[PDB]
Amino acid sequence: NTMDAVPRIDHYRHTAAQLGEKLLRPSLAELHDELVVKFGWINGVLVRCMLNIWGVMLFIRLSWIVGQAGIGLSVLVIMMATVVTTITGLSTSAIATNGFVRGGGAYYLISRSLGPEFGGAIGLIFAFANAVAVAMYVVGFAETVVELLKEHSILMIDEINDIRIIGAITVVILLGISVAGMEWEAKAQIVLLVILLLAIGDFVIGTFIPLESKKPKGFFGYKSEIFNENFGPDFREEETFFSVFEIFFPAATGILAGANISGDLADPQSAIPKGTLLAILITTLVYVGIAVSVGSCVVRDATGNVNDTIVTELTNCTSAACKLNFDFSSCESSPCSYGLMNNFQVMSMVSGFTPLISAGIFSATLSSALASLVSAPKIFQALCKDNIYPAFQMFAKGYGKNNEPLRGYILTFLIALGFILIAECNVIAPIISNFFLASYALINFSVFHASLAKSPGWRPAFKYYNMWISLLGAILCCIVMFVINWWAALLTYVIVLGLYIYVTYKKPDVNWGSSTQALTYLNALQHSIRLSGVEDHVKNFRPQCLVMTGAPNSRPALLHLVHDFTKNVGLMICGHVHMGPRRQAMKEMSIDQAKYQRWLIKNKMKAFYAPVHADDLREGAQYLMQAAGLGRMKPNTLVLGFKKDWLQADMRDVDMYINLFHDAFDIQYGVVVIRLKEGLNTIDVWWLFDDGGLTLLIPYLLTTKKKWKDCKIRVFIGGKINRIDHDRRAMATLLSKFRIDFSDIMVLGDINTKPKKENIIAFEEIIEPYRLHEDDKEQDIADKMKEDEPWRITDNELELYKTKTYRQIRLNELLKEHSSTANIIVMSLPVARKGAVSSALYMAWLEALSKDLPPILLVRGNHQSVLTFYS
Amino acid sequence: NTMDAVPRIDHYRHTAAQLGEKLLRPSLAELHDELVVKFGWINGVLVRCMLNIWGVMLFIRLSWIVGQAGIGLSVLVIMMATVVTTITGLSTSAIATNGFVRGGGAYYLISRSLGPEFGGAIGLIFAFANAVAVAMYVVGFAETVVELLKEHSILMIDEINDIRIIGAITVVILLGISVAGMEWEAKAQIVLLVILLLAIGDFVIGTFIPLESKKPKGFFGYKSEIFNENFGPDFREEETFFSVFEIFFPAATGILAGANISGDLADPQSAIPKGTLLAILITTLVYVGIAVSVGSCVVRDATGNVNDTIVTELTNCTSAACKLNFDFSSCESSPCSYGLMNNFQVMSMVSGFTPLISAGIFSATLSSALASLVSAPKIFQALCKDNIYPAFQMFAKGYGKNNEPLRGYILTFLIALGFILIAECNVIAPIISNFFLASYALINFSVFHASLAKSPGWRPAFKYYNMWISLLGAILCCIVMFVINWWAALLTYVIVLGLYIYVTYKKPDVNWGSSTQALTYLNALQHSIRLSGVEDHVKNFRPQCLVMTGAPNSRPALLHLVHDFTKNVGLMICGHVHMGPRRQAMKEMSIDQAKYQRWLIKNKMKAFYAPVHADDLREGAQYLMQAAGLGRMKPNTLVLGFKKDWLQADMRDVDMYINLFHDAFDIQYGVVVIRLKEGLNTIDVWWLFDDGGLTLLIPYLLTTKKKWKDCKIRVFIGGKINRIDHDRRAMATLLSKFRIDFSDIMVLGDINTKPKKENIIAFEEIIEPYRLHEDDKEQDIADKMKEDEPWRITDNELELYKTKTYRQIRLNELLKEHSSTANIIVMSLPVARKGAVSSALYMAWLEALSKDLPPILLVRGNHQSVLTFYS
Numbered sequence A, B: 001n002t003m004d005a006v007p008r009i010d011h012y013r014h015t016a017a018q019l020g021e022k023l024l025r026p027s028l029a030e031l032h033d034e035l036v037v038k039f040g041w042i043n044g045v046l047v048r049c050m051l052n053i054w055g056v057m058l059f060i061r062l063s064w065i066v067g068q069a070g071i072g073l074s075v076l077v078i079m080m081a082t083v084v085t086t087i088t089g090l091s092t093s094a095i096a097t098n099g100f101v102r103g104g105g106a107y108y109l110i111s112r113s114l115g116p117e118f119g120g121a122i123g124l125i126f127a128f129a130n131a132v133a134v135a136m137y138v139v140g141f142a143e144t145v146v147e148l149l150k151e152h153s154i155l156m157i158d159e160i161n162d163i164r165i166i167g168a169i170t171v172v173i174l175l176g177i178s179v180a181g182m183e184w185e186a187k188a189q190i191v192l193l194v195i196l197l198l199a200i201g202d203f204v205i206g207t208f209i210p211l212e213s214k215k216p217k218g219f220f221g222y223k224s225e226i227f228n229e230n231f232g233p234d235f236r237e238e239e240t241f242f243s244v245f246e247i248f249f250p251a252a253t254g255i256l257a258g259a260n261i262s263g264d265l266a267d268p269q270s271a272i273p274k275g276t277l278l279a280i281l282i283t284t285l286v287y288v289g290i291a292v293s294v295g296s297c298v299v300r301d302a303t304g305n306v307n308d309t310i311v312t313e314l315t316n317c318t319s320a321a322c323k324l325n326f327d328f329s330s331c332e333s334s335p336c337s338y339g340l341m342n343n344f345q346v347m348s349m350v351s352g353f354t355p356l357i358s359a360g361i362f363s364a365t366l367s368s369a370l371a372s373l374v375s376a377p378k379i380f381q382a383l384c385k386d387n388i389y390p391a392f393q394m395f396a397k398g399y400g401k402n403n404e405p406l407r408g409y410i411l412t413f414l415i416a417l418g419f420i421l422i423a424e425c426n427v428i429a430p431i432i433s434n435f436f437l438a439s440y441a442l443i444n445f446s447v448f449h450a451s452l453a454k455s456p457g458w459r460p461a462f463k464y465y466n467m468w469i470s471l472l473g474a475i476l477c478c479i480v481m482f483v484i485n486w487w488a489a490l491l492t493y494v495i496v497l498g499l500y501i502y503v504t505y506k507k508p509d510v511n512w513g514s515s516t517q518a519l520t521y522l523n524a525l526q527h528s529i530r531l532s533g534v535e536d537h538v539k540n541f542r543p544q545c546l547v548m549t550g551a552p553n554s555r556p557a558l559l560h561l562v563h564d565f566t567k568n569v570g571l572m573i574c575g576h577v578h579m580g581p582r583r584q585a586m587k588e589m590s591i592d593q594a595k596y597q598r599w600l601i602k603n604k605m606k607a608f609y610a611p612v613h614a615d616d617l618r619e620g621a622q623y624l625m626q627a628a629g630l631g632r633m634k635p636n637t638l639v640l641g642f643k644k645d646w647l648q649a650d651m652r653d654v655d656m657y658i659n660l661f662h663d664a665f666d667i668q669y670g671v672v673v674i675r676l677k678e679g680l681n682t683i684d685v686w687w688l689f690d691d692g693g694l695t696l697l698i699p700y701l702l703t704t705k706k707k708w709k710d711c712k713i714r715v716f717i718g719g720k721i722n723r724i725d726h727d728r729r730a731m732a733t734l735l736s737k738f739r740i741d742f743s744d745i746m747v748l749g750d751i752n753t754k755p756k757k758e759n760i761i762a763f764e765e766i767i768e769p770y771r772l773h774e775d776d777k778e779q780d781i782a783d784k785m786k787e788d789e790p791w792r793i794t795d796n797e798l799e800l801y802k803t804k805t806y807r808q809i810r811l812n813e814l815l816k817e818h819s820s821t822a823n824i825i826v827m828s829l830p831v832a833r834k835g836a837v838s839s840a841l842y843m844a845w846l847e848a849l850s851k852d853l854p855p856i857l858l859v860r861g862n863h864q865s866v867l868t869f870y871s
């Protein structure tokens, strides 16, 4: 409260409201200003990741992959898939150990890492991918059970339909077991893991246990010549190495099935890393070991038959089959019985109890399917909670004591059932495999992008993640999805890009500190730094304007006109000076900053809103002109709206306005004054005095823009009579060397001539309330009144400023007579000597010159060399 | 002078000094502050471009190209080469019509368009390319003359040596005619052009004039069946279409041979466009017309022999040769006499007088060689004048009334002679052809890059150049140089990149308004705009610091320390407040801006120097804090050096320093104070009060950098006794959730305890000269002295600030006892209530706390939520 307090965790909690009644930080103004189920890492992320990786391939098609591709090359396949998977694991660990991750899985990580765009895109893709991987795992189980009940005669319908029936029944059962909370299905996956490990152990023991009954088959029991033969990549008619990797890689996916449970984990940012990485390690070790064992234990082909005798007749027999026995030897002529390349149930028979390995297949398939079916709706409901796609505002309610996406479970069940009864899993497989690849690629790109933008808030807790390995992982994921069904990769990239576009044009109104935001800041900073090293030059001058807008709403069309000759060229800083007590005005600026900056961005005003606190408008603008900008983006021109209200405004205010003029001149700023009717085809430019070229550059830049592109830029000047043609030719060659594509140059000799009586008497009537009438009251009352500036010095300030006023009024008359048909007028701003002219008289000059006309820009330049005709 | 003057061309002339005595612009301060041979376009750029394009191919190898590739495909070849050439012509015209081009050619255009890097690189490449194209043209003439003097028996030596002899003699003659001024060689090219056009006319007339003597040859005189046959692309054993285009394209090059004479043209920016484009038009028309005529007039092969009788025996004769006559019919069996595909002198014989066409070949070759030999040294001497490569500071003197590169002429003559006597022009041809391609590519990229950066000074006088056609031209040049000898294109790209690197690491100290500079500004502006649309978030906070450096030289290691936790992360604005009269201080700021900004860039300080003019340091820094920055790059922290001199400084100055502290607090700025020994392994952080997380973020960012990466970040806090273990565990979990990888957390209970007598008496002695001794002089003298702030209120300001001082001194003692071994110390900055504490007492607090210690950062934060453990 009154005294500063020691730091506590309570200060930084709930980020909007988290126990705010206790441990609330004291504000700087207060000190200064004077007066329900959660899973551990073992059973929540280790078991689930391990149990999701282990699927159909481990027990069915692995003997095939090690049989065709050689042992030394099948291990290469496994190692490449594991490099991709492990690099993605490090990336996921880096993302997960950054903050506290609320709910969902890969979606939440990627979204909160680098923006709702990639977040929503890849989250939707991953939710679909897991929802259908449910169907893939369950139909693998269907193939297993139908093979078992076709080898054992009893069957009900044709295989292509019995698979559908059994898959539908068991996916219904999977929904039932999953929809009943997560303690129950957690224990269910525990018992499935026990069964799976029993199957692995049975295979290992049986592989160490050879027998003569299986001798006719490829089973021989660790014979060295079998290993020597199987090292080679003995392929088949069609399957190439890339196709082999394509077959295997689905077995590599399934990691971060615990990360998808991040919403229900007891302690993320400590369970995700050492659960996912350790699960990948264990599963890869098991794959490699079992592959080398089965390759070293069984042979390619075996004419399994007792009639195949081990008598071993003395023949050449170059094949190493007869090296063990004449049985299962020399069957290459016709398609012999079975073997690694000719059978799949090798895994079953090399082991001991065939049931204890069959149960391995069922447990692996069910466990992987159940893990995917739990993971998909968590991701989906996290995605729907953020309402990136408002169409799915449902699927996020999550009925139950622990938020469980019942609707998400039903939706993923329907999707899985639909893809089961489609029964075309073979053709859909590459699409979904490289959806998984796309998700992994965006995770590694998540880490790389986060490390690329410095972002002091990046700072993850988990080391071992360096940026280049993550970039390599993204590249490898892209290359692998090219390897797997190139056109599927193109389709996946199209889907990603389409969702990206959809989200970036939706622009969900949400902010969670993307790495994209950090990169934006860092990029803008780096280019400002490189600009700071770029020396100035005439033909790279830009009108970079501080515009005393006030509130940017107050003068809209003025803002548009300035934006016209500053869009995509030069700077535009909309300055607004705030007033009054410091404490209240801090909050005033804080809200106006957001409001007006968003208003500019919404209205495509590439401008910069700069609020300052100051005692009055003059020294607030002094603040702005002195300090606004960054590097060589500091303003060089001050833009004002003509203070139309001076006849009614307090004369101190208009004096402040004129001293603003004078300050801008004093600190080497060009001044532009815009007088237009704000209630809401030639550009006429009367640039009678060489301001330095700015009075040319403004209309030319206006002609550059599309709005004024179809409008001539005819020019007027003043010159002595009898030299009219000479002056016009010199003017034409002068600005033809400036490449200002004029349309008609007019030369006026009527300047410096006494204007009509009506106009002079009108100006005298206007100035009468402020000319101080310095006739009587010689010095005492005269000096007493002059103790405040804003009166015109009758005698003193109308001696030569008499002809100054005459030129002003006559110029106004000339703009009436000649340029009244212009779409826009740009004319030299009159300059009065500092202190020599009463501010009232100078404002009267501006009124007299600028009144009753189309839009006017009274441009006076820095008197530098703004334009050039060199190169 | 005193009065503003009408604009005149004299104001913008010579850009440093050009008739400055007459027509000198009046300065804004003055108004405001109170008190020898030149060539026209016909003979300088039209004749030269036309006469350089027309070379060997027109009269020697063109019959070959139209004979092998079909008429409808030879015209396609010519049209593609002309598309490349004409797009480059539009680009060159756009570049040349921008400013006034001093001297040189393509070098000056490209350099002054987009920087000395591409300028010097491509200028050197083009100078070499023209220097050796001299050799190519002259050896073509050598082949012509040796063929003429071998058909006419008299010969001197073997052809491979007679060509060398005649080429050497005639290149010596070419030097002689070129080294004798440009009026003489201009008239020489005039007469060569007359000869060439006579040859063209003779060919046309002879082609309209058929005869029986040439009837046995391919000459038949516009027979329709000959045209119908020749439309097809009847190629040969080896020559493919791409090879054909490779042969032709050297004939397309040679444009901007007048642009290389830009230094000696009477009026560039009006001669270059309508000379180069018209010359390309005329030459392409002549190529196309002569190609179609010779294709429609002669046949592929002709067994030229009177014995070949036109008797026309009644045979099949599918070939259209016999359609005209049995002569020159059916010779395909063996290699028959000659023809389009079997002879080159067809051009000579289809015409009338063979001498009047032979003279055509000699005139074309000599004229092209002479044009190249004039153009190369102009480019070279322009390149050497800018001293981009200081090694060639010679070759630029240019002796003569008109600056003529005598040394350049000699150098190009030596290069041409060397490549003549090498006599390996066939193998070097693709290298030089795609050097020409590279130069054209950089010209089109010149225009595209210039149009890409808005740059109000771009604005060329010549329309018809839109940016996308120039980009297409650059792409086409790149593709064509791939077509011509791919590895030659790779070598050319390597040479370009190498010269680019050499120049960009040389960094010649010169500024001529590159388009690269404009692009740098525009890119930085665009990314600042996109940053302006990026909403704030806690975990994207950056310490973006306004550092009251003063002169950045004054405190170097302080600048380095701030740069350490701001490099590549957050902003760093080195503010310096200037003093005194406005007029002198304007120039002061103007010179200091350049000096200090260059000093920062040189010393790899990615900082921003911000000078302001102000009455005193306090309100200058007020200017800076209120207004510095752009968009969301405004500073959020104020960094000060501890005013070490306060014991000697005027007490008003240190009061100003403390009110600077207070202003920074008032406008919601965190404050960092650095006290280190500026005369010139654990980071200890004692962050006793929850500033909002900045006191953690600073040392962590220090640990991020390489300099401090190997240094622990151990932390100290204060806590009540009997809760030491609880407080330490809570602290550890708190900043482990903040991922600040601490090394040892220490908890101190000795805080809030009365420190030793020696330290308290030392502090009392220090504060004695300013405690105002408010014992006597009850109110009158007391209030009179208190009419100025900087004295300590003895009675009032030492009631509870007594225990404040006690904590300050005891904390100092503790830093001595514990953290004196640190490499750096970061501690909470004490905050005093505004106006409640005398500024002298607060400065004494800072002295007492910070004295006699390693580098200290007294960090006090905004009291916002700088750190977070969410995501």
Ligand SMILES: CCCCNc1cc(C(=O)O)cc(S(N)(=O)=O)c1Oc1ccccc1
Pocket (backbone or CB within 6 Å): A052, A053, A054, A055, A056, A057, A058, A061, A133, A136, A137, A139, A140, A246, A247, A248, A249, A250, A251, A252, A253, A254, A368, A425, A426, A429, A432, A433, A436
């Ligand atoms: C992203 C992976 C989705 C699951 N698909 C899958 C998983 C595993 C495994 O073991 O995890 C093995 C294979 S497989 N038959 O070896 O290619 C798989 O492909 C299938 C499975 C059945 C139907 C169609 C395709």
Ligand SMILES: CCCCNc1cc(C(=O)O)cc(S(N)(=O)=O)c1Oc1ccccc1
Pocket (backbone or CB within 6 Å): B052, B053, B054, B055, B056, B057, B058, B061, B133, B136, B137, B139, B140, B247, B248, B249, B250, B251, B252, B253, B254, B368, B425, B426, B429, B432, B433, B436
């Ligand atoms: C960049 C072009 C340099 C000049 N080389 C050149 C010009 C012309 C032409 O007519 O301007 C025609 C040919 S050619 N024989 O048709 O390919 C040329 O190639 C040569 C010539 C002679 C020796 C070796 C190569």
Ligand SMILES: [Cl-]
Pocket (backbone or CB within 6 Å): A253, A254, A255, A256, A257, A436
């Ligand atoms: Cl996965």
Ligand SMILES: [Cl-]
Pocket (backbone or CB within 6 Å): B253, B254, B255, B256, B257, B436
């Ligand atoms: Cl050229």
Ligand SMILES: [K+]
Pocket (backbone or CB within 6 Å): A052, A053, A054, A055, A250, A251, A252, A253, A254, A368
């Ligand atoms: K799997």
Ligand SMILES: [K+]
Pocket (backbone or CB within 6 Å): B052, B053, B054, B055, B250, B251, B252, B253, B254, B368
């Ligand atoms: K040529």
